[model samples]
Target chain A: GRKLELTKAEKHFHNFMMDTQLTKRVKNAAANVLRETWLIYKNTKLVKKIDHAKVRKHQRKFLQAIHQLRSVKMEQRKLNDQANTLVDLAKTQLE
Target chain B: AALTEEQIAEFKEAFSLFDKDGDGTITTKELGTVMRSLGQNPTEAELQDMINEVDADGNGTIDFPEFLTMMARKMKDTDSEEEIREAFRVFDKDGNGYISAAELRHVMTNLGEKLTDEEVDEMIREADIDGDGQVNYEEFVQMMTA
Candidate 1:
């Protein structure tokens, strides 16, 4: 099999599994990644080379949809919160 | 998602702030510029790491849900408990409370990654204690702490 690049969702899943102890939650999450990545393997890879062109755009669409799995609203807030904290820290230093 | 009103407002402000050019999403470049506007200057290394950490499909941009969580993970506000816990929660796509290797594989493949069953098996072996054939929060925690 050719080397495959990981998607954001795969990274997100493994990243999660890396930090926590084994439990139902972790197992289930890992399973989910398996299934999702399974789609990629089946649909994107292991196909005819001529089919690559067909699935190329198809795969990109899948990537976008899969990307949503990791993207969340809270990340933006934390960015802001980081800014706010930095501001607070800056003010303290200024004082 | 049962988020607090205050939390939602903060998120909205952040979404608008980073969504420069009025696009629905923010690119890596936009994220860097937005950070500078906030009185913080993230090093190229810092920004690249963040993008590399979350950018899907190698698009060099962070999406909404992933971006917020990344922010939470990186900031000083949340301790590892909150940070990584939230992360695990996000990774729990079905909200089923476990991270299955199959689940990881499914998403990975869709994002243009191909993993052999053996690799997934190896990951399970590492994180799946109790012979449960899956990585539970307990094992998940141990590996993370390890």
Candidate 2:
């Protein structure tokens, strides 16, 4: 089988789908928000269409949700960094 | 499974917000700005938290490549499939069946701690597929199931 070389975005998206990490819940939440937003964007139309302001309002909400998820991921990163830094410092001290 | 058309669109829209400079890269500063715009400004401690995670190469800053790599690592930490699905359902406002930036932002503002625009954009791009700008139910499900 040919090796599939994914771009950065593709790889990230793939990892998001494949990994079972802390941000999984958050990512799922953000994804759900996107799914809902798309529905609204596609449906309502013409004279009886939903207000653009309302749509914008909803979009803002989804954006916020994604923000929360990102924060969780950020927090996890902080923990990992501290761990790695500690290891690095220890290594340097030994050297 | 591959992402559906709707999922691709949602992913693209969400990711585009983070590519502020349109340079195909997201920096720590840009991420911070996004978070502030959403009204969830992180403290210095919080900023450091993200920097540590995304700055895999320890370059002291998070570039697009680093950010993307960090996102992949996050996916590996999922433990609760049901919880993840529930989280998605909760964020998917309008119940029209998909998620959007507006809906996600609303939940963020109301959730425990508010978040900035940068943070929001980061999450979208992290889960986004196809780099389109939107995330549909299929993508949402895949993000969770994965």
Q: Largest lDDT belongs to which candidate? A: 2
Q: Name model 1 segments beyond 4 Å from true.
A: A1-95, B71-146
Tens digit per residue, CA lDDT, model 2, B28-72: 576567666655555555555556655667666655555444433
Candidate 2 interface RMSD to the true structure: 17.8
Over B42-62, each residue of candidate 1 has an lDDT whose tens digit, in order, gives: 656445545565666567666
Worst lDDT window (10 residues) for model 2 chain A?
A: A1-10
Over A3-54, each residue of candidate 2 has an lDDT whose tens digit, in order, gives: 1111111223222222234446666777867875675666455337667777
Segments in model 2 whose C-alpha atoms lie over 4 Å from true places: A1-21, A43-48, B1-146
Worst 10-residue lDDT window, candidate 1 chain A: A1-10
- Tell me the TM-score of model 1: 0.29
- Candidate 2 chain B worst ten-residue window by lDDT: B70-79
Q: What DockQ number belongs to candidate 2?
A: 0.02
Q: After TM-score superposition, what is the CA distance of residue A50 in candidate 2 from its true location, in Å?
A: 3.7
